[model samples]
Target: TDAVLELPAATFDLPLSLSGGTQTTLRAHAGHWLVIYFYPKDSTPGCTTEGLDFNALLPEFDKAGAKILGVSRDSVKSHDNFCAKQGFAFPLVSDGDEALCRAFDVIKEKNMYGKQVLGIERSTFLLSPEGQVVQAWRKVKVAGHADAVLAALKAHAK
Candidate 1:
């Protein structure tokens, strides 16, 4: 089979058992699909907008059978604070160590104001129930991103 319908390679040593310190597995592979997103920081202007968009669509995403997990280099404490301030119903993974971000390939070289930096690039991943990546959007722009992801998931669901 010389076919190449390959998905992005997301490394697996995700430490799925860590539970985001909430007694829940950090990695979920038993759902219909998963939306794993990576952002640069918490409580920033763009980050807040993106987070709020996801939070607003949380119910609809659940109704469509997909759970959203937000990832960032922020500590679990910061994530908790962001969730509280935004009233987000979903858990934000504490990727403080950058291990998971590096593995997912979302960690990248960034340029801002002509200054080069290294950090988590704004991105999203749609993973199949089996854990193979189904779709990946890199360098995502925040405007209408949540709805775009939902549409992609709807079109790609099997």
Candidate 2:
């Protein structure tokens, strides 16, 4: 497990890609709860499902006072295409330099067939309005994951 078990209440200077080529930072969301999910790739089956599921839950998250952001090692162009195809209401952060990935420590070694490959382990972190990690899920299985996160967000709100 990564040592960042509970995200400290500190500002993070990470780059994010939003609509119209708008750039933002993680710290920009300090006043709102954050859902920062890291997936392996774009256009893949699992990643697509996860993005769609989260997109489908955007309104509920907003009502619960949270913002969602999906991060991957993909470039902005790829993210833009994926976002459009998936109809994701949330912005997708392109961590092409793996700065956010390294900061979150989501990169891991996996056995792809008989060879070991370095890739992102599917993960999610829920940060409080104060920027502290309230909950985190590592090695996430996509099924029913969004509902679970939603429940957690509601629970935190209460």
Candidate 3:
């Protein structure tokens, strides 16, 4: 397998805010493990299941000294609606121009039925306090996904 190419670390500093400025990247990695998950869209079936799964297990993640951030091509407003409608415990970062989506290497060529199109391929990243990716999961399955991430973090913990 070819090594995945990630966007340079310099690009994540774009001026953006989420959930009415409840969260921002100004210091997202100041002193904690950061978990960023990328999905395709908002209010869809797979996306909903994935979001709900993360929401349900958020306390556990918080206890583990980590923060959950979901990203997609959806606008910040759309993410706000989805988070409110679904009661998600974490903030969903907006990636409207596919910037961070590509940075995390989640945007890729995917086949839906027989058509090839570009979209978020359901991926996750474990970022160290220094803002570097320590681990990653690409093409993740929604089922057992949160558990798997928790396990990974547990194994990677100090």
Candidate 4:
């Protein structure tokens, strides 16, 4: 599949399951800068660190007028538990149907313990107020990623 260097200007929307059992769409976040990050799974080491890092910088992100959405193929129950466990400041969107995953083109084949597996690739997208892709990070590293994104958001705001 060809890489989506950037999403089209057309209104892009997807059904997402949020924490606390909220059902919503990406269009609902249209008017604000949105950070939609996809992780491989919940409760794992790297995923946990990423989520915690994002939560740590939540206030700064809010100050920059940005909202964050973490997406994974995990069930809503899993997401709810994760949020509660970590006291996340943002919502985790469940993509059990893989519609959101497909839209973002984050699913990829990866080596897990020497076995090839299909999973969500660690990635993040910064969307503009009009919902166009402003920037994106593919195959993200958890360490310092949140800080880097926050800095980029601030720079973009200027």
Candidate 5:
């Protein structure tokens, strides 16, 4: 699939089960810059490392007027556990139906331990306060990813 450089507001008007115990809609966060990230699974090494990096720089991200949201096919219970264990200040969105994942074109076919399967590709989208996608990164690497997103957030400060 080709990268999605923009998203319609109605597209994100999705009800998401976030880590903070809130089942909020993406539309509710319309007024703030959003960094919506998708990871493969909960508590995995790469996912944990990426979350930690994002978690550590959250203060700066908040100061830049951006909110971080992690998404996966994992349940809210799993997200809560992971966030509690990792001390994540940001919220994690439960995408059981992969609505959000497919919306961003992050779900792709890949070999997980050998067998070909459909899974969440490591991806992220930076959206403006107006809900337009400002930038997108797919097939992301763990190292320097948070910093890279943070830099983009600051560079596109709204």
Candidate 6:
């Protein structure tokens, strides 16, 4: 079943728990458009590919007035290592307890390998300069994702 759908929009100003002790919020990032992406793990190939793709487009994202944040349940240390290892230019959020992820409605159960498991479903959120969710994507695919995000920002860039 191939599909992609938008989650209901939301405006969240909640506290963010970014890795490496970088504290911020959706509201803080609002003035400059925002892209909050959630991945399942810190260093998996899928997650790695997912990030580097964005890294390649980060300059464009910044030029378009948008900030990007990656999220996962790993510890901040884990996140930090991945950041260092991959040279990811954007900040990565460590939702150790899934609080931030749950706040955005991305945590869910997945049936992988014929077993049910709780995890952070790959999701991306596009926030407006006004600090409100203008677009949302769930069950995201890695390929050509950065282009879609940048295109969305260009369409909504205001």
Q: List the candidate 6 regions with Cα displacement exceeding 4 Å.
A: 1-13, 111-116
Q: Please, what is the whole-model Cα lDDT of each candidate in the order they appear?
A: 0.76, 0.84, 0.78, 0.86, 0.87, 0.81
Tens digit per residue, CA lDDT, model 4, 104-132: 77888877888998888899988778767
Candidate 5 per-residue lDDT over residues 1-158, each given as its tens digit: 22247555556777888887788777787789889999999999999999999999999998987888999999999999999988998899999999889888888997777888988899988877877777899999999999999998888883
Best by TM-score: 5
Count of clashing residue pairs in every prediction:
0, 0, 0, 0, 0, 0
TM-score of 3: 0.86
Task: Give model 1's TM-score versus the native structure.
Answer: 0.83
> Which model is ahead, 3 or 5, in terms of TM-score?
5
lDDT of 2 by residue, 1-158 (tens): 32246432333765566544788887888798899899999999999999999999999998988999898989888999998877778888888888778777788987878998888999999877766777889999999999999998899877
In angstroms, how far off is 125's CA in candidate 4?
0.6
Instruction: Give the distance in Å from residue 23's predicted Cα in candidate 5 to where it truly belongs.
Output: 1.3
Work out how many backbone clashes candidate 2 has: 0
Off by over 4 Å in 5: 1-4, 111-116
Please give the lDDT score for candidate 3: 0.78
Worst 10 residues of 1 by lDDT: 1-10
The lDDT of model 2 is: 0.84
Q: Residue pairs in steric clash, candidate 5?
A: none
Give each model a TM-score.
0.83, 0.89, 0.86, 0.89, 0.90, 0.86
Cα error, candidate 2, residue 70 (Å): 0.3
